[PDB]
Amino acid sequence: PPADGALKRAEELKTQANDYFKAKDYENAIKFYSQAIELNPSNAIYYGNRSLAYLRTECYGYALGDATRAIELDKKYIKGYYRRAASNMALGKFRAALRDYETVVKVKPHDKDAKMKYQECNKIVKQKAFERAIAGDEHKRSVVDSLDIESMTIEDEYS
Amino acid sequence: PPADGALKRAEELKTQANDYFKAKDYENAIKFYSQAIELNPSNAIYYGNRSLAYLRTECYGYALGDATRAIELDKKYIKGYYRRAASNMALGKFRAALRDYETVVKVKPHDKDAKMKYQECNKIVKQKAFERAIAGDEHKRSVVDSLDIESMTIEDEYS
Amino acid sequence: PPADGALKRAEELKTQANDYFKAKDYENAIKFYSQAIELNPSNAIYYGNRSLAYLRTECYGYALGDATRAIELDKKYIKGYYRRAASNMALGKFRAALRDYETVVKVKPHDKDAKMKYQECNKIVKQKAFERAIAGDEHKRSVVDSLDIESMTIEDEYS
Amino acid sequence: PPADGALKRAEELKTQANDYFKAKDYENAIKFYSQAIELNPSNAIYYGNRSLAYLRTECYGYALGDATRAIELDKKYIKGYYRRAASNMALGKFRAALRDYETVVKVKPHDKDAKMKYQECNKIVKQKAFERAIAGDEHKRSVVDSLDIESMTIEDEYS
């Protein structure tokens, strides 16, 4: 389950796919990670790989799907968390991504790598709140400048 | 309380101030609404007027203060609500202003005036959420374009 | 391309899938829309259907991918726009969804249906800005209440 | 300008006010900082003090006005920047306040005090973006849970 035969042929197709991947032929790499998945539908690495192949051809919905599956299959396959983080950044969901970089930083406490990624990301989350504030600042200046104070009137009636 | 004498002189100074106001001499209009206030410290109209005099010389903190006082004194002096709305727009607190335009629209249901102001304002509240979204959209496009997918790696280890 | 033979068998598998779909067997419906896609990889309806099958089993990344493909294949297959809108709502990207409901409302101007969907959506976009404002209001009240004004000091030095 | 006489009496009234301030009698402290201001209208400390007296009685618009004036009069009277920061926090304009705490931190680089205030504030700016995100997260969960996927339909027409 699969027979040792589906397991061995799935491992060949995966290699075939890798070749195609390293040679920039994504269409074929995706085609072959898929066959390997048909035969060994529970191998997290295949999904991790195909997810990346999907990130390289800008298919962010597919990559996210493949990334979540990898994590459903092996809760402790780190790259699944990197593939999902990458898919969510591409989809613009930066805080969802930060959640995954955090997870990795927690299990690889001294991996300078994890730290770097999570930093880049927390940064991008803060620059977003930044660009938004400025725009709100820029807009306020324009409203205030356009305020019709001149047409306002003093109470010209007894008091 | 005040003596009929403080009441009558307060009404003269108020007029003196109005003159100065209509003649664009804000420094003096403020000087005289103040004297009228010293003598009749509970007249809402004086505060309403001085608030406006403060909006005309860009003193938004003073105008807001004078506007809140007018409303503390006569809960149903409409202009106090317009002075406070105007002060909060200038201070960039658009939703606080909208709250006041709403109040006026509720008591003057058919005053096309109230409707117009409240419309301008709800609009400015929506344009703000707009400019902010765009900026967030613009920033996302730039993050996604800069995402280092190329340095990501396929699992090059047995699986 | 495909041979009339792949075209006819793809249309059977699609039906097989539909059966499985209407009988709530999503795992099998997905399995069969896929075979139909292997044989007729350019049929937008198959993708539209599989996308929905993906929305029903909560696989929002896959559904979005299948929805974008349907739109790449037939720019004027409306449901593709509904599948993509639905996938983006589920993914929390409400404004991206609104963009698609708008497109449909523009080509089906009198379809009360299009209007209804786009209304639900513009509403959800406005309720989001709402819940966010309140939370910001609630937080401000708490900061202001906690402000240490009492420890502030008057200038106790000559002036 | 003023005559040495207005200068000396203004300094007495200021003291009178301080007494009233330290004895929690704000109404009178405000009354006397005002007289001192009438006689020496250009003394920044009087404004700084009255601003605080205004923060203590919750008159945030007046305090902000008095704080800006103090800064117009003596660009390097630090407390003016603390009074304005305090008025803007109370008014909910946290980032405007942060701007002032930054200014002070820049001229008093080693004043642990400046650092502490600016920290409290940058924190409050970040907790606000926080409470807002959560609310947006909470709302998304509810939309997604309410999404009518069940009424969606597979294409039941030839393809």
Swiss-Prot record, chains A, B, C, D:
TPR repeats lie at residues 10-43, 44-77, 78-111. Ubiquitous. It is found in: Nucleus; Cytoplasm; Cell membrane. Activated by at least two different proteolytic cleavages producing a 56 kDa and a 50 kDa form. Belongs to the PPP phosphatase family. PP-5 (PP-T) subfamily. Serine/threonine-protein phosphatase that dephosphorylates a myriad of proteins involved in different signaling pathways including the kinases CSNK1E, ASK1/MAP3K5, PRKDC and RAF1, the nuclear receptors NR3C1, PPARG, ESR1 and ESR2, SMAD proteins and TAU/MAPT. Implicated in wide ranging cellular processes, including apoptosis, differentiation, DNA damage response, cell survival, regulation of ion channels or circadian rhythms, in response to steroid and thyroid hormones, calcium, fatty acids, TGF-beta as well as oxidative and genotoxic stresses. Probably forms a complex composed of chaperones HSP90 and HSP70, co-chaperones STIP1/HOP, CDC37, PPP5C, PTGES3/p23, TSC1 and client protein TSC2. Probably forms a complex composed of chaperones HSP90 and HSP70, co-chaperones CDC37, PPP5C, TSC1 and client protein TSC2, CDK4, AKT, RAF1 and NR3C1; this complex does not contain co-chaperones STIP1/HOP and PTGES3/p23. Part of a complex with HSP90/HSP90AA1 and steroid receptors. Interacts (via TPR repeats) with HSP90AA1 (via TPR repeat-binding motif) or HSPA1A/HSPA1B; the interaction is direct and activates the phosphatase activity. This is Serine/threonine-protein phosphatase 5. The gene is PPP5C. The chain holds residues 19 to 177 of 499 of the full protein.
